[PDB]
């Protein structure tokens, strides 16, 4: 349903992550065709107060004047709606609703905002969700059976009690091949080759002595998964595997390119 250019996603994460928690805000720009398919191309970072920002961020001269400026040498069409930048927890909007819900119909019903999370999303899967005006009207969309993943939110009572008003739908994504593609020696005996095969073979010596002690010891009188893998005195044997792995990616490969 709701679409994004994902430049709005990166400027979104930029403005959010830059200003935590401070709940930074802004408002994006796009176009409407039907019920709720909203292409969002650019988010507009409206400025920050001291520590608590509200409807006062809806300024005359900043969004009006700069909407004229990047209307001229940039994004031409009308705005969509706002956003909000929840740090930490996730998505529920208690004091946010009185500062956001009444603002929409001043413009249009074709107006969404979105709460994001640049703290708990360290991921490559960032928490994004728009919503509705279900302040009132408890009075269609076959969806293939209610869309799936909003019968799986973090089902928490204050969140789901917020979801009575909220009703998120989807977040689509676009990108192009160009952008995709874009994003996608030596050292020899300085001291290097010696002093990382003079090092690691010594831990292979006495760590293989402790591997000897491990195989001698656990051979008999062993039960219950070696007392839960020796959480204590970690860790024999695997250490040897790791050591073996470290040199054979190094003492060959760039040495190979030496040839």
């Amino acid at each position: 349903q709701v679409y994004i250019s994902s430049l709005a996603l990166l400027k979104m994460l930029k403005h959010g992550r830059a200003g935590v928690p401070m709940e930074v805000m802004g408002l994006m720009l796009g176009e409407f065709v039907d019920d709720y398919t909203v292409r969002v191309i650019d988010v507009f970072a409206m400025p920050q107060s001291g520590t608590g920002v509200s409807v006062e961020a809806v300024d005359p001269v900043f969004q009006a004047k700069m909407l004229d400026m990047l209307k001229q040498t940039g994004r031409p069409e009308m705005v969509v709606g706002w956003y909000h930048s929840h740090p930490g927890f996730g998505c529920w909007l208690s004091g946010v609703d009185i500062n956001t819900q009444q603002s929409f119909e001043a413009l249009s019903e074709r107006a969404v905002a979105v709460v994001v999370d640049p703290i708990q999303s360290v991921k490559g899967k960032v928490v994004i969700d728009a919503f509705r005006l279900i302040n009132a009207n408890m009075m269609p969309r076959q969806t293939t059976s209610n869309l799936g993943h909003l019968n799986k939110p973090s089902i928490q009572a204050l969140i789901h009690g917020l979801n009575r008003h909220y009703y998120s739908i989807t977040i689509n994504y676009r990108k192009n091949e160009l952008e995709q593609k874009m994003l996608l020696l030596t050292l020899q005996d300085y001291s290097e080759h010696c002093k990382h095969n003079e090092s690691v073979v010594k831990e292979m010596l006495e760590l293989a002595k402790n591997y000897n002690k491990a195989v001698e010891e656990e051979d008999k009188m062993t039960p219950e998964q070696l007392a839960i893998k020796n959480v204590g005195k970690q860790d024999p044997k695997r250490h040897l595997e790791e050591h073996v792995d470290v040199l054979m990616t190094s003492n060959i490969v760039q040495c190979l390119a030496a040839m």
């Binding site: 250019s5 994902s6 430049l7 996603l9 990166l10 400027k11 979104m12 994460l13 930029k14 992550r17 830059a18 191309i41 650019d42 970072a45 409206m46 400025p47 920050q48 900043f62 004047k65 700069m66 400026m69 990047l70 040498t73 940039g74 640049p118 999303s121 360290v122 991921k123 490559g124 899967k125 960032v126 990108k175 192009n176 160009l178 952008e179 995709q180 874009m182 994003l183 996608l184 020899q188 005996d189 080759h193 095969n197 073979v201 292979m204 293989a208 591997y211 195989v215 044997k237 040897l240 595997e241 073996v244 792995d245 040199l247 054979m248 003492n251 060959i252 040495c255 030496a258 040839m259």
Partner: protein, 206 residues
């Protein structure tokens, strides 16, 4: 003086900007300024306007402005974030000429370092790669899951002189080969330990 780092924030911004100006005609060196922290190695982290580029179509001897518009977006992003200073400016790929060095010089106003050349490094995207690693789906990063100068070029080429160097090269290879032989052994042993673990496991599951 250090090099440049990168943030693909400005890369997606300029790429979307040439998705903007790509109407009928107008293959244009669209110059827009950057704002961000400038110090030792940086990127000038965020883009700006352009005052879009048109000369005649190729007669590139006439300019774009305002300096008050420089401090429109650069001035009123200070109301949003105050960490920034202009150095960076871009244009299209890949051709440059005296127009571009004349906007380095003529429209200078700070810009000591701004190549979009020794400052040549295309960065890491610190602390905001969450908006990159979500944007690195189908086909993935690797796959994830998988005359004077040229006169001085060949001054440092010739080496077949194997007496000394050859012997040395032979030797090092031998020593490192040995290391690998030593290793490729203890992982074979611990692999065999996993074999007897699996065989006694399924042997007891009989």
């Amino acid at each position: 003086v250090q090099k440049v780092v990168v943030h693909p924030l400005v890369l997606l911004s300029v790429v979307d900007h040439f998705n903007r100006i790509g109407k009928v005609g107008n293959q244009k060196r669209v110059v827009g300024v950057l704002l961000g922290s400038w110090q030792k190695k940086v990127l000038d982290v965020s883009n700006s306007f352009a005052v879009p580029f048109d000369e005649d179509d190729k007669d590139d001897s006439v300019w774009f402005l305002d300096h008050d518009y420089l401090e429109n977006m650069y001035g009123m992003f200070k109301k949003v974030n105050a960490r920034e200073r202009i150095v960076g400016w871009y244009h299209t790929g890949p051709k440059l000429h005296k127009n571009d060095i004349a906007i380095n010089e003529l429209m200078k106003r700070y810009c000591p370092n701004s190549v979009l050349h020794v400052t040549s490094e295309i960065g890491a995207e610190e602390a905001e790669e969450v908006g990159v690693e979500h944007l690195l789906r189908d086909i993935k990063d690797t796959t994830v899951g998988t005359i004077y100068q040229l006169q001085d070029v060949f001054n440092l080429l010739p080496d077949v002189s194997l007496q000394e160097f050859v012997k040395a090269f032979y030797l090092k290879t031998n020593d490192q080969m040995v290391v690998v032989y030593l290793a490729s052994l203890i992982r074979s042993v611990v692999a065999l330990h996993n074999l007897i673990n699996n065989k006694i496991a399924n042997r007891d599951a009989e």
